[PDB]
Amino acid sequence: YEPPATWENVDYKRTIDVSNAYISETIEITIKNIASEPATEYFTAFESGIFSKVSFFSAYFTNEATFLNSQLLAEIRYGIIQFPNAISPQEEVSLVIKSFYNTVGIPYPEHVGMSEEQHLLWETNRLPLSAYDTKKASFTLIGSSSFEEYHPPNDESLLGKANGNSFEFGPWEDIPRFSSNETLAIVYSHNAPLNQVVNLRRDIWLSHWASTIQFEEYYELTNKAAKLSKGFSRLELMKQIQTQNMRQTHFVTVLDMLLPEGATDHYFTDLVGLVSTSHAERDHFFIRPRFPIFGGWNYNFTVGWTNKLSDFLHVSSGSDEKFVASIPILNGPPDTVYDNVELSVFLPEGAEIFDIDSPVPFTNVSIETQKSYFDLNKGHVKLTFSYRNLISQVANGQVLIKYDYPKSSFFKKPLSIACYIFTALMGVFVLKTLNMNV
Amino acid sequence: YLYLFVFHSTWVTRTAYSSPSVVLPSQTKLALIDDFREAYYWLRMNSDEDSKVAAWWDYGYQIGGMADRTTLVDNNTWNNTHIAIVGKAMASPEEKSYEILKEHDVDYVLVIFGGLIGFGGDDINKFLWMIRISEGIWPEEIKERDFYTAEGEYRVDARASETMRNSLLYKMSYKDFPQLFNGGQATDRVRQQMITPLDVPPLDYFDEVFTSENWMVRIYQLKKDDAQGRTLRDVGELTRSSTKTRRSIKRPELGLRV
Amino acid sequence: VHSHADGTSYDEEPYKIKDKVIYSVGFSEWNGEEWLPHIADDIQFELRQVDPYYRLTLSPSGNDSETQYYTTGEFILPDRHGVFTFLTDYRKIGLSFTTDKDVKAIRHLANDEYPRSWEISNSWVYISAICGVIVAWIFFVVSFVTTSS
Amino acid sequence: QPVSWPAFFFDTHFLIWLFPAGVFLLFLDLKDEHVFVIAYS
Amino acid sequence: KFGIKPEIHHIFHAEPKRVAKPIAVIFVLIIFITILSLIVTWLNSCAAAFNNIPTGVTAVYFLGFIATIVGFEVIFARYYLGTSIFETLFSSLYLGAPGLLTSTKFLRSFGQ
Amino acid sequence: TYEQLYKEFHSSKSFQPFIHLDTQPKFAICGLIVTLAVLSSALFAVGSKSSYIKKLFFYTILSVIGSLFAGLTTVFASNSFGVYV
Amino acid sequence: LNWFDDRTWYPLGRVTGGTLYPGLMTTSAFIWHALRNWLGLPIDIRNVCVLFAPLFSGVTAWATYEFTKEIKDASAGLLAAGFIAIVPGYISRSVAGSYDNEAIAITLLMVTFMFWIKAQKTGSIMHATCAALFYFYMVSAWGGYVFITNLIPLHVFLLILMGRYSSKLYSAYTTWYAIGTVASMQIPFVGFLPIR
Amino acid sequence: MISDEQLNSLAITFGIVMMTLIVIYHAVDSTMSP
Numbered sequence A: 001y002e003p004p005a006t007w008e009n010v011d012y013k014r015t016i017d018v019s020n021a022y023i024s025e026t027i028e029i030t031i032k033n034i035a036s037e038p039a040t041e042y043f044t045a046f047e048s049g050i051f052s053k054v055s056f057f058s059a060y061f062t063n064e065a066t067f068l069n070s071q072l073l074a075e076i077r078y079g080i081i082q083f084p085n086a087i088s089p090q091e092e093v094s095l096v097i098k099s100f101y102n103t104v105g106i107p108y109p110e111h112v113g114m115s116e117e118q119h120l121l122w123e124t125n126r127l128p129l130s131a132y133d134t135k136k137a138s139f140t141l142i143g144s145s146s147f148e149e150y151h152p153p154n155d156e157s158l159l160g161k162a163n164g165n166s167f168e169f170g171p172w173e174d175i176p177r178f179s180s181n182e183t184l185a186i187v188y189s190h191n192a193p194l195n196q197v198v199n200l201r202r203d204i205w206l207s208h209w210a211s212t213i214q215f216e217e218y219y220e221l222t223n224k225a226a227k228l229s230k231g232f233s234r235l236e237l238m239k240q241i242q243t244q245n246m247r248q249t250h251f252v253t254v255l256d257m258l259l260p261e262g263a264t265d266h267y268f269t270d271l272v273g274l275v276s277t278s279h280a281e282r283d284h285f286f287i288r289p290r291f292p293i294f295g296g297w298n299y300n301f302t303v304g305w306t307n308k309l310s311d312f313l314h315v316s317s318g319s320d321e322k323f324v325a326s327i328p329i330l331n332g333p334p335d336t337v338y339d340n341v342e343l344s345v346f347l348p349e350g351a352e353i354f355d356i357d358s359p360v361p362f363t364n365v366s367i368e369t370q371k372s373y374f375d376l377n378k379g380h381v382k383l384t385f386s387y388r389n390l391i392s393q394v395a396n397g398q399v400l401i402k403y404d405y406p407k408s409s410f411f412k413k414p415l416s417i418a419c420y421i422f423t424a425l426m427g428v429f430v431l432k433t434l435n436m437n438v
Numbered sequence B: 001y002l003y004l005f006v007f008h009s010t011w012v013t014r015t016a017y018s019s020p021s022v023v024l025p026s027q028t029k030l031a032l033i034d035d036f037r038e039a040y041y042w043l044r045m046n047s048d049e050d051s052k053v054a055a056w057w058d059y060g061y062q063i064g065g066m067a068d069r070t071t072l073v074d075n076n077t078w079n080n081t082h083i084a085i086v087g088k089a090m091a092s093p094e095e096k097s098y099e100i101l102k103e104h105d106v107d108y109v110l111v112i113f114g115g116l117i118g119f120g121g122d123d124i125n126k127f128l129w130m131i132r133i134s135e136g137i138w139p140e141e142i143k144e145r146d147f148y149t150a151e152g153e154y155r156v157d158a159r160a161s162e163t164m165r166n167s168l169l170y171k172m173s174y175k176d177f178p179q180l181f182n183g184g185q186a187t188d189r190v191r192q193q194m195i196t197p198l199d200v201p202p203l204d205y206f207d208e209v210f211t212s213e214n215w216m217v218r219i220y221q222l223k224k225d226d227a228q229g230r231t232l233r234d235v236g237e238l239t240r241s242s243t244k245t246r247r248s249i250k251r252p253e254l255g256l257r258v
Numbered sequence C: 001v002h003s004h005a006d007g008t009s010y011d012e013e014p015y016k017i018k019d020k021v022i023y024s025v026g027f028s029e030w031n032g033e034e035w036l037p038h039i040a041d042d043i044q045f046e047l048r049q050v051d052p053y054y055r056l057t058l059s060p061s062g063n064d065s066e067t068q069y070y071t072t073g074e075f076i077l078p079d080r081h082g083v084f085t086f087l088t089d090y091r092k093i094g095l096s097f098t099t100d101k102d103v104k105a106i107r108h109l110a111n112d113e114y115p116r117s118w119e120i121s122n123s124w125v126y127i128s129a130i131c132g133v134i135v136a137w138i139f140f141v142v143s144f145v146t147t148s149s
Numbered sequence D: 001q002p003v004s005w006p007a008f009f010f011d012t013h014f015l016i017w018l019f020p021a022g023v024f025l026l027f028l029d030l031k032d033e034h035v036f037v038i039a040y041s
Numbered sequence E: 001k002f003g004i005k006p007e008i009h010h011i012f013h014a015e016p017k018r019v020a021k022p023i024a025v026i027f028v029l030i031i032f033i034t035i036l037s038l039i040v041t042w043l044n045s046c047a048a049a050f051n052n053i054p055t056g057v058t059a060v061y062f063l064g065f066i067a068t069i070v071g072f073e074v075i076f077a078r079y080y081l082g083t084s085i086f087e088t089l090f091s092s093l094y095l096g097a098p099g100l101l102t103s104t105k106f107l108r109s110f111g112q
Numbered sequence F: 001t002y003e004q005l006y007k008e009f010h011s012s013k014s015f016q017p018f019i020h021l022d023t024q025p026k027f028a029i030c031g032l033i034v035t036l037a038v039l040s041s042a043l044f045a046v047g048s049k050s051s052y053i054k055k056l057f058f059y060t061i062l063s064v065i066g067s068l069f070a071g072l073t074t075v076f077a078s079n080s081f082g083v084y085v
Numbered sequence G: 001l002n003w004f005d006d007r008t009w010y011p012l013g014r015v016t017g018g019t020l021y022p023g024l025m026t027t028s029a030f031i032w033h034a035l036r037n038w039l040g041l042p043i044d045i046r047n048v049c050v051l052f053a054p055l056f057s058g059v060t061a062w063a064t065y066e067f068t069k070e071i072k073d074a075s076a077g078l079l080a081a082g083f084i085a086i087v088p089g090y091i092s093r094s095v096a097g098s099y100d101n102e103a104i105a106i107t108l109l110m111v112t113f114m115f116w117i118k119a120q121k122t123g124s125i126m127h128a129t130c131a132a133l134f135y136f137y138m139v140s141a142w143g144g145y146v147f148i149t150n151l152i153p154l155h156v157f158l159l160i161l162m163g164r165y166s167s168k169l170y171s172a173y174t175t176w177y178a179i180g181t182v183a184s185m186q187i188p189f190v191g192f193l194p195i196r
Numbered sequence H: 001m002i003s004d005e006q007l008n009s010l011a012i013t014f015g016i017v018m019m020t021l022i023v024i025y026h027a028v029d030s031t032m033s034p
Ligand SMILES: *[C@@H]1O[C@H](CO)[C@@H](O[C@@H]2O[C@H](CO)[C@@H](O[C@@H]3O[C@H](CO[C@H]4O[C@H](CO)[C@@H](O)[C@H](O[C@H]5O[C@H](CO)[C@@H](O)[C@H](O)[C@@H]5O)[C@@H]4O)[C@@H](O)[C@H](O[C@H]4O[C@H](CO)[C@@H](O)[C@H](O)[C@@H]4O[C@H]4O[C@H](CO)[C@@H](O)[C@H](O)[C@@H]4O[C@H]4O[C@H](CO)[C@@H](O)[C@H](O)[C@@H]4O)[C@@H]3O)[C@H](O)[C@H]2NC(C)=O)[C@H](O)[C@H]1NC(C)=O
Pocket: B079, B080, B081, B082, B085, C051, C052, C053, E008, E009, E010, E011, G012
């Protein structure tokens, strides 16, 4: 669906940041309307390969920011922005788009030694794919230290002018419409570890009898950094530890898990057993895996802790037996990108969910049951969300569940276990009043 | 005596019969060692799920229990010949051990080495039990009275034999061990011998892919045979040490083409 | 691709000792412009452990616009259990080397998948004698209870 | 693989010297039950 | 080296011969004549016949007794042809629980 | 509506628990003594001698009491050892 | 029961019908399924497989109580149970993580011997058939069942040489051998071996 | 979770309570039996 008309871009900045293993853009537009029926909408154009991997999309006004209604739809594909206070047909407006991606690039030497810097290859557009005509448009590539182009063009214009830790250029005037005329490829040094997980399932467990909430998380993380040539040698790793100071390099030795405020019973296990190299200091759960995760290596592990329920659960006002829970949507290391997240919250056995709200647009949601310990009846209410593309730093949200849990179903747990003990002992009575004596 | 029986029966249980067989607390300091789960979980995480791991037989269950990979020998010794295959492969030159470890579709070979921390149950002192059970099946290929120093000693340092130095498990276990400490000397803690980098001949058919933190469990890979058909020791002597920009042109004495 | 002789695959029913399978591979050559079907003798299937158990030359029995297929006929799997690989190394000097291998597990007979005792002609005596002892036992307990001592 | 006597004292504390006296005391009233314990000892 | 190679066909193992079939038929009806000789020896000829039959109100526990004794042989006979061990096991549980009570009141009713 | 549920969340009381976790193993031990005394004295009502209807009556009332003390006891002793509910 | 296990002995496999004793695995799987579906608490199979020798340590103690109760009065049975509950000779092969096939062996050796002595005292047919059911279930588990089939015949034979034969000794031993030898022949590791 | 010295105290006190009430049972049985 192509937009007709009624927006023309006077100014158009485009600042790509490349500094923390996910690409973030901060577009800044100043638009002018044409003399027609005053329309109130906007269309932001993404490629078909970038629209598949996008995790956050927001808009500000530049005067003083409140928010705007930024909706992402579901072959250039679009994303709509809805304005309040419908605009007169000839007036300047100002606007800020922020967006956060999933891809970071390919290691341009894919094999590199562990004591050597890596360089990544990112591919993008240089002329901006706008759905409308632009009159002025500057590009700015902020980020790490060293930026270098890949197959530089013969034109002396459309060429990068390097600034102090920056790379500034762009086609600056009179770009008519959708412009896939040239695709940029830039290599750049990047000393972050590039942690990314493939499948995160995290199970929480509300409990009214214990008044506790119990977090358990299963991470399947890869390191998408550059692979290492000549294999792995413990001699070069151990000498690399013994030389100096462990600066910033590729592989993963420790992870810093940022937990909720008061967390009590910390554990960190692999598939084959538990791992004893973990340190649970106040508010921070540090983790050392068994082997250091170099470029391309896999590691699947499980962490878990226990919070009290008095700060995640809140009794409603109209009815005493109606509870409202707000769950942290994501806890993990500070530099991670999540390719799949499934958040399973487990309400107790007699709970009935009324209302569900999530701040991040999920891919899926369903309500099932699952039998845990002493679930003699149907079992826990498994409300499971499926989120696809998330960032650790960006997706700051809480999932809000409104349910009820009456005291008719609160005492059915000891009464159900009492029902099994009672029918077992009356079963003992039938098998002892019974005469079998030939 | 009934009350003394309880204190005896709990002291004996706590001291002598309550220890894990996986975590190895040798205290090289009350330090625990989990190099077996580190290496086996490297095989579980960083290998294709149909790779075949040829280790010695007394570690055969734990690999299949922890690495979830395919082995060749195993703890119950019901086929002794198939154990003499791996015992023949561990004690033979790597020219004749690559040939027998690719005929069986093996891509990973792991060894146990307790020379940096003093484990003693490594695969260099149960190495003679790899030559006894493979000498009775294949005599005059693998033979004892080799691996000895012509006076009856079982040495590991530069006093050792030539068949001991060119063996597969020797140069797989002691690879990069003299370059560990400094100065080109290395004090093996179990065998109490010092080795030098002019020992331990290089490995031209295998390459290491993992080695644990205390150097216990070494994991090696059969690197693929060369594309141009030449032998891998000729690739090894190609890529190094030869020959000071000096040449020779000669009738190559190769026979005749069929 | 290899499958059972009646059309089912390895995935639906895994293989078994003394089983009927079919194997099929198709070749194609390239004269610089088009992928033409490759007419050839000398192509050999191998069913293989450490040592080969089958070398069967491949008859064409098929055709396509850019592929000539080859079959091996219905051949019986060995009664030797084990993990057998299905191998075609087409290695003829002058033209391109190709290798296709698929490693499969081939298991023993289950306890149910045996010739049955009523099916076999030799065990009719023992079924008749066990049935005789059982029926004579039932008349022994009814006759023992209903008599008066 | 033969074993020495401190494994016999080690595995059973004072039962190792009530073990023969129990057998000798099971002879002196020899029921048909006790032949099992004597032969099994 | 490269070129054609001789074929291999895996000459199989031989199966031992079963039996001549009418010999097995002969022994089947020999065993039939022996079992029929047993029943014809029991019922009238050796006079070990039915001296008493409990025609009172304890007849229903006798028919329950025949229901258990014939019932377990019906369960085992079904188990001989197909009928996996779990359905046989729940079958002899669902027969063994009411059946042991009506096969013990009967043996309480007869003191002999 | 996420804003209605957010306002309705942040204007609410916290979760006041029924029985805290630190007093709960003492309820587990005292409950174990109670249900073990009641059920331990319940198998001797069928145990010694009686008639049938009084043995049924006292067995079923004493088994109801000891059964419900047993169930509530194993809820609290479930929560005591680390597993919850 | 029909598991080829292509993950071991790679070109050969391991049939695991006639190289395995299927009595430990079906017991701990019966406990796992039993407390899984019938009792309410789903615990992991690793915890059933670990905490298995501590569970049957107590059943070994109860069976030693009943055996010594058949030899002397019950007050010696509680001494024997108190001895074998904590003795270091059995706790060596019965440690908490030890799924090594003698965790289930001795708790069937003592139930087998308990029903044998209880079958040979009173001469009952039933106690010598349920001596043979636990003899079969002892054969399903451990490969040192052979001890039992050289000890119960060694007992009976010493009952013959001493002149202590009776109808109880016949009526116990001959149905122990009948049921226990037709039944122990069904385990595929032990085929017609008890015939030859 | 319980520690290892506290498990040692638990195992020893089950042993001492076990042997103590065994001896009490044997005394009450041996005194008051015909
Ligand atoms: C425990 O583990 C052990 C190790 O993992 C394992 O031991 C191995 O077991 C296998 C299976 O039996 C053994 O393979 C056989 O080995 C035979 C040994 O023959 C020796 O002597 C021959 C001369 O007499 C040599 O030819 C032979 O090979 C030599 O030459 C090769 C080529 O030049 C070379 O690669 C060798 O290295 C070696 O130098 C060896 O020295 C071997 O005879 C046998 O071959 C037959 O079977 C193969 C299929 O199984 C065919 O591929 C092969 O062509 C042969 O086929 C013949 O037999 C088939 C039926 O068996 C027929 O279908 C064929 O048509 C053909 O039949 C012809 O010959 C018959 C007489 O044999 C005749 O009756 C026919 O009419 C027809 O004329 C096979 O390779 C292996 O050697 C064992 N390895 C070791 C180290 O012991 C053991 O099995 C495991 N335990 C358990 C319980 O599983």
